[PDB]
Structure 1
Amino acid sequence: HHHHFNLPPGNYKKPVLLYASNGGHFLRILPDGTVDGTRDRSDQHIQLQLSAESVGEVYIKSTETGQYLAMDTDGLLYGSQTPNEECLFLERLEENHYNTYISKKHAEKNWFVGLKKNGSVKRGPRTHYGQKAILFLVLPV
């Protein structure tokens, strides 16, 4: 293990929003595989579904398009048609309150899912522990 094992209460059954504490954007996976954020709560592409593959390990999937959130070899988030090793994230509690998502493939590099205040997602190497960008609240809809 390269990381701690504080887990959030799990939310896998229901479709959810991933709300970025850092600026209030919702994580969005567009039909063309682009990943960003939007503050438009009505957007059809911010509805996500998480599934636990192993304890503490998740897929994050678009309910609208079926795409899997993934992080590529250069640290960029993308929407994948099929589940692969780039699609698994370590779901952890952070600051006793938030959820973080670490790339499993790149766990030793501490690459996180992260949203900037301007609604663009962060590249893996530009994320790290202690940032606001990595902090999510998983909201039921």
Structure 2
Amino acid sequence: SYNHLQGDVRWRKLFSFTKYFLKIEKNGKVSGTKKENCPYSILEITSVEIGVVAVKAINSNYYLAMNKKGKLYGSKEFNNDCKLKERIEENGYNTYASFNWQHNGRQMYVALNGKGAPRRGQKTRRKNTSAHFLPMVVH
């Protein structure tokens, strides 16, 4: 049961609280699938700096990212819109906040809504279940 606490570069899947697997498809677009096979949910999480990571859709060579505006998107080239701040909330779920872009002082979080739809950064909230994710081992 422990192998989830292992490794530097980690291959994981991010299951949203809204029961969706965050995926990034070849067209660059970010969304959450409900399938268990969609090979666009196989993310490659890596540390860029203490507490900060780079989530990569291992197959569509896209880095999960957030533009200063507040919209999810995946660029083939790694930039500062890719640096995500990973944190463990008090409910066992993870939250991925933009390391750079903020708004109205609050932080913007990567999030999926009721139906795998990418939420708007500005409208997301740390404590709101929309931004929780259960990282899942893949091997």
Between the aligned residues of both structures, percent identity stands at 32
1:75 corresponds to:
70
After TM superposition, the structure 1 = structure 2 runs for residues 122-133 of structure 1, keeping only pairs within 5 Å, are 122-133=119-130
Matched, 1:30 2:25: yes
Query: Conserved in 2, the CA contact under 8 Å of 1:50 and 1:60?
Result: yes
Query: Conserved in 1, the CA contact under 8 Å of 2:10 and 2:46?
Result: no
Aligned Cα RMSD in Å?
1.5
Distance 2:124 2:10 in 1: 28
Matched, 1:20 2:8: no
One-letter code of the match for 2:16? A
Change (3 A) 1:36 1:43: same
Change (3 A) 1:136 1:76: same
TM-score after normalising by structure 1: 0.87
SS in structure 1 of the partner of residue 110 of structure 2: coil
SS in structure 2 of the partner of residue 133 of structure 1: helix
TM-score after normalising by structure 2: 0.88
SS in structure 2 of the partner of residue 110 of structure 1: strand
- Stretches of 4+ moved more than 6 A in 1? none
**Structure 2: runs of 5 or more not aligned:** none
Deviations 1:81-127 (A, max 9, x none): 11111000100011151111100112453100011121101110110
Of the three residues 113, 118, 121, the one matched with 2:115 is 118
How many equivalent residue pairs? 132
Query: Conserved in 2, the CA contact under 8 Å of 1:25 and 1:117?
Result: no
Deviations 1:5-42 (A, max 9, x none): xxxx5764331100001x20100101011001110111
